[PDB]
Swiss-Prot record:
Record keywords: Calcium, Disulfide bond, Hydrolase, Metal-binding, Protease, Serine protease, Signal, Zymogen
Native source organism of the sequence: Parengyodontium album
Designated gene of the protein: PROK
Binding site for Ca(2+) 1: 175, 177, 200
Domain Peptidase S8: 7-279
Catalytic activity: Hydrolysis of keratin, and of other proteins with subtilisin-like specificity. Hydrolyzes peptide amides
GO cellular component, as recorded: extracellular region
Keyword flag Nucleotide-binding: no
Name this protein carries in UniProt: Proteinase K
EC number(s) stated in the UniProt entry for this protein: 3.4.21.64
Record: residues binding Ca(2+) 2: 16, 260
Length: 279
């Protein structure tokens, strides 16, 4: 399948080179997989989700995304026009308030919730969790991310936007999950992207068009935007049977575009998420 005039980030993950505008992907498109978006919520009624999104848990007064961030990330995972895995099932868990903030205890509870809730869902091709959030180092937050991964969920987390070593941020610094940095459309490390030895992979993160609340769209930037590209790619690859939740991060790194990025500090991987599609 081919989506013409795609957002640059989708085109980038299906090409060996920057500057293309078509997103090439297998028609299966993540069908049968499930992705939990752990964030500010998801505007499930947005036409772009085609009935494939639902809120399953909130830690606040409402399950509504009053911010937009969660809806944007969910759109990059699996919206029709802006998504990597266009037929996946999306589950929203609202651990962040409408200002985009949340206590660590709530974020931990949300991770533990997904590890249990997945046992009540029909996700034959597997389960992914996308965490476009983080803050200062916390061994408890790292431990929760490790538990979620251990339970059989592919966990993708944002490296953070401090232009610093991700070792000082959580859950970015948990080795066992998939920690995602951001790049721009000219294959440069995004100027804000964290780096360091704990990064596993880069994905498109600067000027990313996706869904927004009020049935709208907008373009924003961050490692928050790169993370759902990798989460969606994992769901896509698991549906194709190429990898499993336990090994998806490794498989993505193994099959990545290597050495394409500039402004990568020594000691940080030079690997860019790639779907290796061939018609
Ligand atoms: Ca290349
Ligand atoms: Ca890792």
């Amino acid at each position: 399948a081919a989506q013409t005039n795609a957002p640059w980030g989708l085109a980038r993950i299906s090409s060996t080179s920057p500057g293309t505008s078509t997103y090439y992907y297998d028609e299966s498109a993540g069908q049968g997989s499930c992705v939990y978006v752990i964030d500010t919520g998801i505007e499930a009624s947005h036409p772009e989700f085609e009935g494939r999104a639902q809120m399953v848990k909130t830690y606040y007064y409402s399950s509504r995304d009053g911010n937009g961030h969660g809806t944007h990330c969910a759109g990059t995972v699996g919206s029709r026009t802006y998504g990597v895995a266009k037929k996946t099932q999306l589950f929203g868990v609202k651990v962040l308030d409408d200002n985009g903030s949340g206590q660590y205890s709530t974020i931990i509870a949300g991770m533990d919730f997904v590890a249990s809730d997945k046992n009540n869902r029909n996700c034959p091709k597997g389960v992914v969790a996308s965490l476009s959030l983080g803050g200062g180092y916390s061994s408890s937050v790292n431990s929760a991310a490790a538990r979620l991964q251990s339970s059989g969920v592919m966990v993708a987390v944002a490296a953070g936007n401090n232009n610093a070593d991700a070792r000082n941020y959580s859950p970015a610094s948990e080795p066992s999950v998939c920690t995602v940095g951001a790049s721009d459309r000219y294959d440069r490390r995004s100027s804000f992207s964290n780096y360091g030895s704990v990064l596993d992979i880069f994905g498109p993160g600067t000027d990313i068009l996706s869904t927004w609340i009020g049935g709208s769209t907008r373009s924003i930037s961050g490692t928050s935007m790169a993370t759902p590209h990798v989460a969606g790619l994992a769901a896509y690859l698991m549906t194709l049977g190429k990898t499993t939740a336990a090994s998806a991060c490794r498989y993505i790194a193994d099959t990545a575009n290597k050495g394409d990025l500039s402004n990568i500090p020594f000691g940080t991987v030079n690997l860019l998420a790639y779907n290796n599609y061939q018609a």
